[PDB]
Amino acid sequence: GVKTEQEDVLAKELEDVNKWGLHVFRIAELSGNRPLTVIMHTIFQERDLLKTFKIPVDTLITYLMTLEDHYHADVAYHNNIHAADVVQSTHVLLSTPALEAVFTDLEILAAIFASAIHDVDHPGVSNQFLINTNSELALMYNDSSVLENHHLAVGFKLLQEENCDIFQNLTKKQRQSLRKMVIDIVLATDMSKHMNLLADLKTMVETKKVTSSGVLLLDNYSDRIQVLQNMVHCADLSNPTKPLQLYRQWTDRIMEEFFRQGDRERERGMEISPMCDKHNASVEKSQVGFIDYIVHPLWETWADLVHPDAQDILDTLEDNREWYQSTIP
Numbered sequence: 001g002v003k004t005e006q007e008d009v010l011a012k013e014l015e016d017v018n019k020w021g022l023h024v025f026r027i028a029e030l031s032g033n034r035p036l037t038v039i040m041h042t043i044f045q046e047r048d049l050l051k052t053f054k055i056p057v058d059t060l061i062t063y064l065m066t067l068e069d070h071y072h073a074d075v076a077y078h079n080n081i082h083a084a085d086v087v088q089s090t091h092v093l094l095s096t097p098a099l100e101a102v103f104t105d106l107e108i109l110a111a112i113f114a115s116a117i118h119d120v121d122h123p124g125v126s127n128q129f130l131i132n133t134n135s136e137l138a139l140m141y142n143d144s145s146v147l148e149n150h151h152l153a154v155g156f157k158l159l160q161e162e163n164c165d166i167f168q169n170l171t172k173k174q175r176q177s178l179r180k181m182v183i184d185i186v187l188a189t190d191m192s193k194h195m196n197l198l199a200d201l202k203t204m205v206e207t208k209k210v211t212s213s214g215v216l217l218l219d220n221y222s223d224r225i226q227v228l229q230n231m232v233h234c235a236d237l238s239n240p241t242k243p244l245q246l247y248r249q250w251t252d253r254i255m256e257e258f259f260r261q262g263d264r265e266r267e268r269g270m271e272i273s274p275m276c277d278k279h280n281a282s283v284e285k286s287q288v289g290f291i292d293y294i295v296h297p298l299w300e301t302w303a304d305l306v307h308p309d310a311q312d313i314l315d316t317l318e319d320n321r322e323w324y325q326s327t328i329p
């Protein structure tokens with residue numbers, strides 16, 4: 001009734017679960033490709049979510065196992081490892097000193113559950129690819145946030161599988177509030193909403209208020225959900241803020257996925273999407289452009305909101321940016 005030796009090495013890696021820079025690829029290897037299940041289980045136990053929401057542990061494991069199985073093992077980036085990474089990154093952001101005692105257990109559950117489902121059943125191609133190919137998903141969702149609508153529908157539908165309803169003991173009021181917040185968070189992961197999310201986060205930093213020394217005041221749903229939306233969006237765009245050994249693995253995987261979409265586009269005689277042409281590729285320049293135009297403006301604004309809690313992450317992002325710049329030939 002004590003762990004195998006592989007389960008021990010996994011348990012020792014999972015001691016890093018509260019730190020930016022977890023060996024998530026090593027956790028994927030040690031868990032038999034179960035990073036999402038073991039990281040979600042660890043976070044739920046750590047935050048006492050099973051007791052708070054009366055989640056039977058067998059139901060939690062069955063749902064997590066089912067959810068993880070609906071991420072595609074043949075997709076290089078948008079897979080269970082990326083889901084596990086965004087969950088664990090959201091978990092660390094929720095622990096930021098500037099947000100201590102700000103969020104309810106229901107809001108914490110929403111942010112973590114949203115992170116876990118936010119890319120489920122991703123086919124490894126973009127919304128524009130799905131729209132241009134007249135795919136069933138684009139037709140179901142009227143070409144609007146096709147993938148993000150689909151991730152939500154699958155994440156919720158999987159609750160109806162045998163012993164998978166982890167919310168079975170929540171009141172209707174709790175379930176309606178959880179459901180609305182999860183939908184609002186995952187729809188905000190659509191990059192077409194990035195500029196509006198960032199504009200609203202900047203407005204909040206300019207008008208920010210702190211109460212009882214240090215900790216953010218968020219007194220309406222609009223502000224509370226905007227911060228959770230930006231938090232999970234930051235977690236989703238967190239790769240360039242990680243130690244470079246992790247960042248380079250994420251860059252290899254996103255480039256494999258993008259080049260594969262570009263190959264699908266070229267073989268069909270479609271216009272090849274930005275950064276998807278492996279014959280016309282500038283990986284280093286693209287990463288510097290990605291950091292300069294998207295990731296740095298977002299994380300700089302987040303860093304202001306929670307000043308100074310995110311200084312080390314912003315420092316790592318700036319170091320990684322200089323490393324990629326220095327390798328442009």
Ligand SMILES: COc1ccc(C2=NN(C(C)C)C(=O)C2(C)C)cc1OC1CCCC1
Pocket residue numbers: 191236237239240247250251254275283286287290294
């Ligand atoms: C590790 O590096 C990355 C991780 C995620 C992304 C994404 N890009 N986008 C949009 C903006 C196209 C997205 O939705 C996501 C967030 C999936 C991009 C990355 O870097 C690439 C940009 C151009 C080539 C290298």
Ligand SMILES: [Mg+2]
Pocket residue numbers: 118119147189190
């Ligand atoms: Mg997504």
Ligand SMILES: [Zn+2]
Pocket residue numbers: 082086118119189236
């Ligand atoms: Zn994602």
